[PDB]
Amino acid sequence: IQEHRYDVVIVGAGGAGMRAAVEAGPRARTAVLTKLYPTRSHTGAAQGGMCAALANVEEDNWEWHTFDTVKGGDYLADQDAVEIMCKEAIDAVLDLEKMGMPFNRTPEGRIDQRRFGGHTRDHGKAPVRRACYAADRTGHMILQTLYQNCVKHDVEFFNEFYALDIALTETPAGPVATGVIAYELATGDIHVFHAKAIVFATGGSGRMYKTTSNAHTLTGDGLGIVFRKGLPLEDMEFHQFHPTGLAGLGILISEAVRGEGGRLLNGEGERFMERYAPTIVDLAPRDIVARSMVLEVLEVPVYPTCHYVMGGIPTTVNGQVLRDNTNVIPGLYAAGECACVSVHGANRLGTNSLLDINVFGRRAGIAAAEYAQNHNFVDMPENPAEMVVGWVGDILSEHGNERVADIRGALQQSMDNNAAVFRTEETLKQALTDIHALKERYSRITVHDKGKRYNSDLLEAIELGFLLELAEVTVVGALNRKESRGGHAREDYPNRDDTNYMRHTMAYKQGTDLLSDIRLDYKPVVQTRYEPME
Amino acid sequence: TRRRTLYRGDPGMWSWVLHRITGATIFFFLFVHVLDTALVRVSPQAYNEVIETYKTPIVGLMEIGLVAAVLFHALNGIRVILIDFWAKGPRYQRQMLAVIAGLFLVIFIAAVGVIGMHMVERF
């Protein structure tokens, strides 16, 4: 059991992870923990653009972008963070370009921009040509550029290191984050990285649904880890389901049909989208389009696919994991899709995701580096890997009559038939009983390798545990919120009740085992200028 | 431990392996044959002895084999030179390959016919 003495330790190597690594790379002694190679990250799947108000092809300021992003999130986004993100978004795109990213160029040679979705001129007038793109492959170029710069500045990557938990040391002023306990897939040896700051950039969690659009390696482990350490999770019941979903499997079809004449013809031989929602043809918000298609099916083939998660770890603007509504864990940061800085609110606007990861990954990296400069090592408890070693040993040495594949398949099938684009009360209660049964079946499973060199059923079972926890969180939160706002949509209560639910919901883990209860607290929504209206 | 397995890739790969084999063939032949020709600074009888032992049917079929080797090497080397010097070369790789297969078959059946009629009238 090795032990590394370090400083800012980043857990993730996607866009947010590698942005934080190029920021806090020179400033401190940084390590990056990845469970893939830095270039196999979901970010690379991003086909669309990255929108920032550079005003090259047309003229547009950042307040228009802020209004677009606040109205898209159905008035649940913290407008403080929305403003900060747009203002820093201009410079984030420019900094990517100056790091070497091959954007598409204008006849004059600045950077080309093209239109995208609901990015309108001023408060709903005309599209703006806002989204900066590289090619049919934008996330791949962002990923490659960030990796090339981490190679340039000689960052220390720890590739295929499954970070399994963090060590929280308790002090008279509260708990403080000390180290990360990782499991080297290549050798089976548990490592303990001692740090002063800790950045979590572990991406989203869509693999708890049968038909999804996320990588096979997007299970949700930042969320699961900080949810097991007692810290809360913010509004996890807000999943964006994309309309174009290749009804067979789930692959996204934003390849070509997006910026062309996609005739959404469905039913038997009919067109429907204006029969349902006129005043706009098919560039309506993704959640509205998906609800329309699904309620149409309830009366090339496509079908909605779980695409994005708007919840995650609650965070300030500077990237700090706030414990409850106003406290803060010292030495713990979050960035990317796992973090909930409350920028997308109840629905995410296209091309704001790569923007978000750039802006807030940079901020979290700077903040963690400067914290590691100011403060010092606090302490660490006795041999902090006891829980992880006992966990792995218990999983390994046992035999049961259940298989991870069947448990995971049943979880995904129930979560897809019940807690999906349309969800009801008895529906969500069936999902809860199913998840409790699967949680008590997960206690007796087997792995068939018992080796220690490249063990994959082991980590497959561990990830199944994480998925079960997050599925419980999602279903209980969505059963709590009795309204239909954004990606969330209930058939019992079908309109936006703004008198009680304009507030983030937060979930705290009471127990420590799998089958436990969850306490649901609330959190107010920061409001500056854009009061609700529709 | 050493596994043995065939890659089964492009046809340019088999062109390259034939190129290498035929080139080495010509090199070794050239060593031997420059020696036996250098035998001409010794005696007309020495030279006649040796090259008369080079007029047997075994060495005749070997002459045919060496003609094949040199002809294929020349054609494929033209293809390689074109790929390297011509800017639109790498696009027409397989076109050139089929063309030189055709040229090789034509010229080689002609050359075997001629050498064969010589060997027939000589016996």
Partner: protein, 146 residues
């Protein structure tokens, strides 16, 4: 509206980043080849003064100039080691001198690197042909050719 950006691509085979303004200028050839080509032009010129001007004098001005020259004259001159070595040195020094000079001339009149490459190849071919032909004629000459 703004001013369209200038294209930096000279030709297809030329990386524009090679003529970047802030790019470090580092040597683009065999090290110490230019020093020795320079020194060769100087030394071979010193030798060629005597060789070439003595050749011209003896040919044009000595007895009856060109109006005495024929095969028997050549065959009498090349029966002497002095004139054989003189003409071999003249051929080799003069061809290498001229070929290096035309290397310089091509290098500073050719605008494209492809033109420079193919003109240097033609030059090397022509110089090699003349050197092997002259060397063959000198080495393998026999007055009793008919």
């Amino acid at each position: 509206l703004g001013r369209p950006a200038p294209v930096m691509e000279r030709e297809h085979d030329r990386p524009a980043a090679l003529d970047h303004p802030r790019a470090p200028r580092k040597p683009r050839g065999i090290p110490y080849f230019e020093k020795y080509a320079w020194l060769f032009m100087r030394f071979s010129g010193i030798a060629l003064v005597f060789l070439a001007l003595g050749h011209l004098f003896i040919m044009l001005m000595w007895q009856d100039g060109v109006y005495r020259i024929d095969f028997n004259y050549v065959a009498e001159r090349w029966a002497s080691p002095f004139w054989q070595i003189w003409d071999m040195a003249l051929l080799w020094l003069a061809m290498i001198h001229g070929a290096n000079g035309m290397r310089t001339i091509i290098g500073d009149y050719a605008r494209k690197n492809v033109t420079k490459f193919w003109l240097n190849s033609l030059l090397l071919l022509a110089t090699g042909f003349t050197l092997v032909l002259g060397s063959y004629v000198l080495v393998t000459f026999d007055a009793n050719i008919s």
